[PDB]
Amino acid sequence: KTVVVTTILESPYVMMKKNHEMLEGNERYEGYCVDLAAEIAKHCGFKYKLTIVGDGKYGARDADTKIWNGMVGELVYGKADIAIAPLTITLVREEVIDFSKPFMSLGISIMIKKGTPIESAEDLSKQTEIAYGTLDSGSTKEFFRRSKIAVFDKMWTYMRSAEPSVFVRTTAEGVARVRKSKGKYAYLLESTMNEYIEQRKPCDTMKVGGNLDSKGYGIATPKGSSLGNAVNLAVLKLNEQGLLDKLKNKWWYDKGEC
Amino acid sequence: KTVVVTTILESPYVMMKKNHEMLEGNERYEGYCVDLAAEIAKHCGFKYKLTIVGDGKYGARDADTKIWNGMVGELVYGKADIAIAPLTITLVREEVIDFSKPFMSLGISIMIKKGTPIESAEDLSKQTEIAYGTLDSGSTKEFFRRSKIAVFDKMWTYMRSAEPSVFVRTTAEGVARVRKSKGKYAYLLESTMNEYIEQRKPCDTMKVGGNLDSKGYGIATPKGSSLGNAVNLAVLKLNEQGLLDKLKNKWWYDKGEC
Ligand SMILES: N[C@@H](Cc1conc1O)C(=O)O
Numbered sequence A, B: 001k002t003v004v005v006t007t008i009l010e011s012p013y014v015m016m017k018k019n020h021e022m023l024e025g026n027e028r029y030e031g032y033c034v035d036l037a038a039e040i041a042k043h044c045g046f047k048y049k050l051t052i053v054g055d056g057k058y059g060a061r062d063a064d065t066k067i068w069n070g071m072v073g074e075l076v077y078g079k080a081d082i083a084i085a086p087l088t089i090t091l092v093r094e095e096v097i098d099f100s101k102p103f104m105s106l107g108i109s110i111m112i113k114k115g116t117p118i119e120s121a122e123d124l125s126k127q128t129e130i131a132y133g134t135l136d137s138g139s140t141k142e143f144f145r146r147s148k149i150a151v152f153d154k155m156w157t158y159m160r161s162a163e164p165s166v167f168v169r170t171t172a173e174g175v176a177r178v179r180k181s182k183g184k185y186a187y188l189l190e191s192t193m194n195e196y197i198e199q200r201k202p203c204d205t206m207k208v209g210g211n212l213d214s215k216g217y218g219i220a221t222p223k224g225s226s227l228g229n230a231v232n233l234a235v236l237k238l239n240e241q242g243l244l245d246k247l248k249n250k251w252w253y254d255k256g257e258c
């Protein structure tokens, strides 16, 4: 009956505590989703174990094997009972797993090294000196791969065939690439992560332009899971009580470093 | 099998066409939700009839009779098969009807007559010369009635006992009150409606401060309805294809009058 929670090491949702090596179990972790997990478990009356997704991915269906990877896969194949992470609600995922209503609203955005002469996706698409990419799997990459909108289709055509690869394995790698590329690399990632990093030292990045879309993160469970109903009601209650807003402030701005 | 759609006359979601008196059926109406209804019906393969909610309300449980009114009530009592309108996803409603994932994101906001010395909810709560209210039923009024947050609790205590009443029957009445009160009345309504009105003549209102919360509108169906699954997938597809963003631009800004 201990609920197995799959999540991902993504700041500031789930991070290793500074003294994690001296701790064990759930206590090794801290962050927005660690706090959210505790709140959801309290309101739903369950005990849980936090586990970091084995392959470190969000979740996508492998085009060759048709097998789902990441957190989505752990739910699909019964390795975890629930996913509490910044997992984007998308059509392809909705078809295979259940999602609570959004606990956070967001959109794809552009991260640049301060001073980079870019203000929008259109700007990126109309030039070649500044390379740009996305996480190598997940909703952002899929957004571009499937887009039929002129600007985005043009961006995908460039990104997919760009060499060396413009895609990264983790958000942290994308941020590092922006910071080390002297303005010659821009990273496409969710506004939530972008806004967080903008308030972290060395305070050398900036979110520019409006978001490309409007979507949300949902707490996921295996399709048909009896846990889904209570979890969804918990998310709505937590949002209405102002807890979710308090948590974003706690992990994004209260201790901002810039 | 013709699907009965309940909706509400709320600009720019559903409005009477200028020549409505010479037309009949669905063709009498136009707006964001009229377009959305057509798209959803197309993707789900159903024919429908648009009907305007009899009591003109969004939906709340009468504390005396325990009977649900508005669009929520029409779904609860089987008078309509689906609601396609700016119906806010809330905990109390989620418990009695089904909701698709959000088709629009929004939050409670403040509408003022241009020049009014108010920039936030806190400002409103710390003064008495400028009266303020909400729709007389629905998620915004409930937000304040149930709030345990200092500023909002203080605002509710004032609003509920204010005489004459600071509540209005329709969004249009709230807007008119702001426009005719010479800056002595501020209206609390959803950002979506606020942003729309700001671009309508006489261009004398303004949205001020940040939103008080973050939530969304969902397409609703009776609890357990077989129509829910397809409708939800349709909303996600329409959002991912960029249609929803196109529709907001079409009805909010493309023909803005300011
Ligand atoms: N939340 C996204 C992944 C993601 C995180 O930040 N930018 C991204 O692209 C997903 O669920 O794939």
Ligand SMILES: N[C@@H](Cc1conc1O)C(=O)O
Residues within 6 Å of the ligand: B058, B059, B086, B087, B088, B135, B137, B138, B139, B140, B141, B171, B188, B189, B190, B193
């Ligand atoms: N969408 C809300 C009503 C509403 C519309 O605009 N401001 C409001 O308060 C609801 O569903 O009650």
